[model samples]
Target: TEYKLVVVGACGVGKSALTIQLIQNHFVDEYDPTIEDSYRKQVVIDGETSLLDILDTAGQEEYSAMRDQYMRTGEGFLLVFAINNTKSFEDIHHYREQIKRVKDSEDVPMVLVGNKSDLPSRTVDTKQAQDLARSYGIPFIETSAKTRQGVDDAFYTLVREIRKHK
Candidate 1:
């Protein structure tokens, strides 16, 4: 099955970083904000062939007007935030809320990602983030787009969740 997933978060919170990490298999140091980019690739999930259609959406305020439209197009979501930035953590709720609002369902398939895991000093508590994910009834994953840690897992986990929706 093909799953449409969206990556969203506060600006510079590694939304594009995660997507580029997974799609290109590398890290990007310079911050080139994404307007909207779509990536398609076949992946293996539990020994089954699956296609992931990912939309890496922009997080800048200027892009707000198009966010809802992009949100409505996705079947799954990867809500990302930098682990070392508390302000970024606050945006996670808003992103999830936006997805739920656009989809008109609390049953949005999603994974809350704490990005920048490779950073030395962490600001957002992992336990706290996990609790928030539980509250939203979704899984939480800590990923480092720089180190490629949990990047693939984050995407794969979201695909698995989307697969279960049917």
Candidate 2:
């Protein structure tokens, strides 16, 4: 039910958007950070009720410093990026690297999330992005804030992964 998920990304990506939707079951227009450090939500996954403990770090301009802080305590992570933003996509390596560095393990549980799937034109392709996910040895999924697509699958998959490691 519950997973320690750290949503990592640059400032403009849909980190908070994904979190707000999962926790509230509704999309907020603005992507501003409203959560404090963490949040818990009750939802259904594969016909079973579950809980999610989500930690969404906001405005990660000082990303390196905070990486250890969050990754050290989290069981898993959602490395999110806007499909249209190439820079956001490229930053995944840094986050992924930081996760390994902080945890001292390459076997960190995580998921690569390509958000803003409702947009018509995307710079990132599913196949290519999925390959990146495979490179990290983690699962990959796409999500849309406006359409509410694949959102639960991403969260639940990461939770089940953490359950496995536990």
Candidate 3:
């Protein structure tokens, strides 16, 4: 099956970073805000072959107009936020709200991702993120694109969620 995964987050919150890490297994330091980038990869998940069509979207406010289009097409979403930035965490609510509004369903498949776990100082507590995910009835994961920690699991878990949603 093909899973259309969308990565949504506030600007500079590592949306591109996580996508690139998952697709390329490499970290990019420079921040060039994305308009939209699509990546496709085939992997085995739970003894089944799956194709992931990932959309790495722009987090800039300028691209807010495009959110509805992708939200409509995406099968699952990764709601990413930087652990070091509190505002990014706060912005997740709007993303989730928009997704649910566009999809016209409360039971959309999604995963809450706290990125930049490699950073020494953290502003968003793990428990807080977990509580939010619990409220949303989705899975939560902490990831570090640079170190590749939890990067694969984040995407894979979303695939599992997509399957479960069906």
Candidate 4:
């Protein structure tokens, strides 16, 4: 099976970091401005072979023009935010809204991600994120691209959501 997944977030929220960690098994420390990037990987999940077509999107407002185009094609989404950035956490609502508006469905497959978990201080509480995810009826996970913690589970969980939706 093939799954089309998207990673959406506010600027500087580590969307690319998380995606790259899953694809390349390493963290990218430098900030590289991204317009868009696509990656394909084959892996076994739940004893079944699956192909994941992932889109790592631009978080800058300048690239907002291209958002709806990809949102229309995505089968599932990873709404990412930085654990230490409160504003980024606040921006998750808009991203999810845009995705649902483009998809024209409230029941879209989505997972809430809090990245940069290895940081010492956090502005977004774990319970707060969990509450938000519960309200949206989606899974929430905290991941660290630096430590590679919960990276694969985040993407795999989105795959499971997509599979369930189908």
Model 2 stretches with alpha carbons more than 4 Å out = 33-36, 44-50, 63-67
Global lDDT of model 3: 0.91
Alpha carbon lDDT of each predicted model: 0.87, 0.81, 0.91, 0.90
- As for candidate 3, its clashing pairs are none
Residue 127 in model 2: lDDT = 90
Alpha-carbon runs more than 4 Å astray in model 4: 62-65
Which candidate number maximizes lDDT? 3
Give per-residue CA lDDT, model 2, range 1-166, as digits (tens).
4557788886677887788787788987876464436898876666767677788876535646655676688888889998989899999898888778888888878889999999988998889898998888888889986678988888988877777676
Candidate 1 lDDT tens digits, 1-166: 7889898888888888888888888888885674677999999899999888999887556536467786798999998889899998997888777777889998988999999988999989999999999999899998999999999999999988988877
**Alpha carbon deviation, residue 140, candidate 1 (Å):** 0.6
lDDT of 1 at 3: 86
RMSD of 3: 1.4
Total backbone collisions for each predicted model: 0, 1, 0, 0
- The clash tally of candidate 3 reads 0
* Cα-based TM-score, every candidate: 0.94, 0.88, 0.95, 0.95
Q: Please identify model 3 stretches exceeding 4 Å from their true place.
A: 62-66
lDDT of 4 by residue, 50-125 (tens): 9999998885575354678876889999999999999999999998888878899999999999999999999899
Ranking the candidates on lDDT from highest down gives 3, 4, 1, 2
* Tens digits of per-residue lDDT for model 3, 101-153: 88998999999999999999999999999999999999999999999999999
Candidate 4 worst ten-residue window by lDDT: 58-67
Total clashing pairs in model 4: 0
